[PDB]
């Protein structure tokens, strides 16, 4: 089979291909028996999670985690199973070379592949083309995808995530009380089609927060407009949202309306954002690792030995 380790700036969410749920959610997942079956895990339990804002800070930590998400929470061997790792969109090449050196050299994995988290999210929803708006805890990303691959040239990156969202709400300071504001953020926070008619009975606009770059709907629109005019229909009509940040307000229709406004009066835009399987990236990875085109895309161990960081970078510089 193929181990599908979904880092997803969350937990490890590792398992096997074919499983509808991961089997190794390490971060925040016996005793009185004999052996080292708690101490070895007791060490990892208090180890800081390397990925911050969707980027790996401490690699030794991450490697120790993976090693403990292979030998302890899966009780398997990576020397015979291909691995599908996940990376955040627009992830530096250096991080890719590091993780590929870890897998092929340390864990001696026969073959591996690194997929974009938004692409796997789109896969778990069953589609292969569309523009994914991924807004988590630290970053916001718009990933246009056509034929199942994240077009590396139309990835617009703005920053208005859970933190930036709860910020203005705090404005309306202490950790516990800004987390009361964040509890309200976690709970119902219905998106407003029009803030006028929503405040009458009491990210889209940078000025609201205090930024001066662009809204998320503007971001999606321009990411669609930096693609093929023929696939434009598919991008506009298959916009898939993901991320607990964007889920909390449940923003579908405000986006839809202002994106329709921006787009020509031709393409009909439909946004599918009701899943919330809480393992979308994992299921997308499992689907990919189950396919045979994954064997096609395999960066093999021999390929790695022959090319190195160049094979991880897929040439084409």
């Amino acid at each position: 089979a193929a181990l599908v380790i979904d880092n997803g700036s969350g937990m490890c969410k590792a398992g096997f291909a074919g499983d509808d749920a991961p089997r190794a959610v390490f971060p925040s997942i016996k005793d009185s028996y004999v052996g080292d079956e708690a101490q070895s895990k007791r060490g990892i339990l208090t180890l800081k999670y390397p990925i911050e804002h969707g980027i790996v800070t401490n690699w030794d930590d991450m490697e120790k985690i993976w090693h403990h998400t292979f030998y302890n929470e899966l009780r398997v061997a990576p020397e015979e199973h291909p691995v599908l790792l996940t990376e955040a969109p627009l992830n530096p090449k250096a991080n890719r070379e590091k993780m590929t050196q870890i897998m092929f050299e340390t864990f001696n994995t026969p073959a591996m592949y690194v997929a974009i988290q938004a692409v796997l999210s789109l896969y778990a929803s069953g589609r292969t083309t569309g523009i994914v708006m991924d807004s988590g805890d630290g970053v916001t990303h718009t990933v246009p995808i056509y034929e199942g691959y994240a077009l590396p040239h139309a990835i617009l990156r703005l920053d208005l995530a859970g933190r930036d969202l709860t910020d203005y709400l705090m404005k309306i300071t202490t950790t516990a009380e800004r987390e009361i504001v964040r509890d309200i953020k976690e709970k119902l926070c219905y998106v407003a089609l029009d803030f006028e008619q929503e405040m009458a009975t009491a990210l889209f606009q940078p000025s609201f927060l205090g930024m001066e770059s662009c809204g998320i709907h503007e971001t999606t629109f321009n990411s669609i407009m930096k693609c093929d005019v023929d696939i434009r229909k598919d991008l506009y009509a298959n916009t898939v949202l993901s991320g607990g940040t964007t889920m909390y307000p449940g923003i579908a229709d405000r986006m839809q309306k202002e994106i329709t406004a921006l787009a020509p009066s031709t393409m009909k835009i439909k946004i599918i954002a009701p899943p919330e399987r809480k393992y979308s990236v994992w299921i997308g990875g499992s689907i990919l690792a189950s396919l045979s085109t994954f064997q096609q895309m395999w960066i093999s161990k021999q390929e790695y030995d022959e090319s190195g960081p160049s094979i991880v970078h897929r040439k084409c510089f």
Partner: protein
């Protein structure tokens, strides 16, 4: 419904009383088959294939998924008996259920529940008094074999029954090892300080009593030694890792020439701490925190044994047992950082021992106190867990025998004597409370009845013989030696259980009666039930 309009169901009168009694009876019938030397164990499958074999009534009622409140009450009763005594968790449930049954029979006869409750309370008080005055044996008159007999009685009905002949010795030794005296010079036997480890493999007879301590831990590096003889032990409650500045401290370089030295301290700081420890002579270093590889190398080069992620309770016990001092910091009252050799503990040996493809640590012959560990050895994890539970029951029993030096006979002797005495005593108390006390007496007989039933013998004949013997004892002052008679379930015949060695701590029966009586009273006061529909 109807006039009330409450959004829920309502049971009222004989209906809800019958329901409560049915629930309690259900819970008691779950566990009735696990009572006495002839009781049998139960499997419990947790809807996922997780299996649990057990004879412990508290365990059984904990694993069950109960919805009725009158049954949750009996589950909590078994839990409370397990917390406060450690044995009697099945008998207490059976007795509470039988008291409920007979008391509901009385309430059907239209004896007011207040009167039944008064009679039950009176009968409980007088049964406690009669036990404390007539049915107790002092363990001083018997010596040490009394403890062994109490342990064997508690271990009978468990998977360490026939081997009790030997397990009791271990149990007794273990409690005697963990004996410690406090202020007022009263001896205290704090079980749960005996460590119990499980390791499938060799037979039960190969289970081990370690005079010292056993740790479910191993050395941190394979280059470290795995045996040390004159063990000087350092118990640390902090981690030995590369030093990280705390939250309110930042490193900001404006002269690159300083960066190197700063990085160097991040490790040299920890090095210095370890050197101080090793400077005192410490050959064994246990820590509740972690130990980086950098530090493990210092321990390796020193010829020391370092252990990380040890448990706080294991550490407290090793410290108390060896003479060491748990340090959360290397910091003294002089504003400096040092480690004194007086903070060390000692032990005649520390080893990394192999046990069925799994290693542990053995600290043997600690000074400043004796400690005790027990490695249970069976055929698989299910048996080992049942052995752990059985041994916990036995240890609690021996502890109770040693704290209060009174025991009572077993085999239904206490229940038979109380049945006789209370059926004679009810004649003086009122007219309806008389019926309540007689029913309390008759209810007490459910224990020998159940023992005989489980033995597959004539319960009626056996319990009648028992009551005859005990009546002879209570009406003929020359025959009080008959009080000690109870059931022999291997032959179906009464027997002098004080001479046979069937002893139970007085506190067991006393607390069983008190808790069962309160539970029955609590359930017997309900005459209505409003079950609301869920808010959703």
């Amino acid at each position: 419904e109807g006039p009330l309009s409450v959004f829920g169901d309502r049971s009222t009168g004989e209906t809800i009383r019958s329901q409560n009694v049915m629930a309690a009876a259900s819970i008691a019938n779950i566990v009735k088959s696990s009572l006495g030397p002839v009781g049998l164990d139960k499997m419990l499958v947790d809807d996922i294939g997780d299996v649990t074999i057990t004879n412990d009534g508290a365990t059984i009622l904990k694993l069950l998924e109960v919805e009725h409140p009158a049954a949750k009450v009996l589950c909590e009763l078994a839990d409370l008996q397990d917390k406060e005594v450690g044995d009697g968790t099945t008998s207490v449930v059976i007795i509470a259920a039988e008291l409920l049954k007979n008391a509901d029979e009385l309430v059907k006869q239209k004896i007011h529940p207040t009167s039944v409750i008064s009679g039950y309370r009176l009968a409980c008080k007088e049964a406690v008094r009669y036990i404390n005055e007539n049915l107790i044996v002092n363990t001083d008159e018997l010596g040490r074999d009394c403890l062994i007999n109490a342990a064997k009685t508690s271990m009978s009905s468990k998977i360490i029954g026939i081997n009790g002949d030997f397990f009791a010795n271990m149990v007794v030794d273990a409690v005697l090892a963990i004996k410690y005296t406090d202020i007022r010079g009263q001896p205290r036997y704090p079980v749960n300080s005996v460590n119990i480890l499980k390791a499938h493999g060799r037979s039960q007879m190969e289970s081990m009593l370690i005079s010292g301590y056993a740790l479910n831990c191993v050395v941190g590096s394979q280059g470290m030694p795995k045996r040390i003889v004159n063990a000087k032990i350092a118990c640390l409650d902090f981690s030995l890792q590369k030093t990280k500045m705390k939250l309110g401290v930042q490193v900001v370089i404006t002269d690159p020439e300083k960066l190197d030295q700063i990085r160097q301290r991040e490790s040299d700081i920890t090095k210095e701490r370890i050197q101080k420890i090793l400077a005192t002579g410490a050959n064994v270093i246990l820590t509740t925190g972690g130990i980086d590889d950098m530090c493990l190398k210092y321990f390796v080069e020193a010829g020391a044994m370092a252990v990380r992620r040890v448990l706080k309770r294991d550490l407290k016990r090793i410290a108390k047992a060896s003479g060491a001092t748990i340090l959360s910091t290397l910091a003294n009252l002089e504003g400096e950082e040092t480690f004194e050799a007086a903070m060390l503990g000692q032990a005649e040996e520390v080893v990394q021992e192999r046990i069925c493809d799994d290693e542990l640590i053995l600290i043997k012959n600690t000074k400043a106190r004796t400690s005790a560990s027990i490695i249970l050895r069976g055929a698989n994890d299910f048996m080992c867990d049942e052995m752990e539970r059985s041994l916990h029951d036995a240890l609690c029993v021996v502890k109770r025998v040693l704290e209060s030096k009174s025991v009572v006979p077993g085999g239904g002797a206490v229940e038979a004597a109380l049945s006789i005495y209370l059926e004679n005593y009810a004649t003086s108390m009122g007219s309806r409370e008389q019926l309540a006390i007689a029913e309390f007496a008759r209810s007490l007989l459910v224990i020998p009845n159940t023992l005989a039933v489980n033995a597959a013998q004539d319960s009626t004949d056996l319990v009648a013989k028992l009551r005859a013997f005990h009546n002879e004892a209570q009406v003929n002052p020359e025959r009080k030696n008959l009080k000690w008679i109870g059931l022999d379930l291997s032959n179906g015949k009464p027997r002098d259980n004080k001479q046979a060695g069937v002893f139970e701590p007085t506190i067991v029966k006393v607390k069983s009666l008190k808790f069962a009586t309160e539970a029955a009273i609590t359930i017997l006061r309900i005459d209505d039930l409003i079950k609301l529909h869920p808010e959703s």
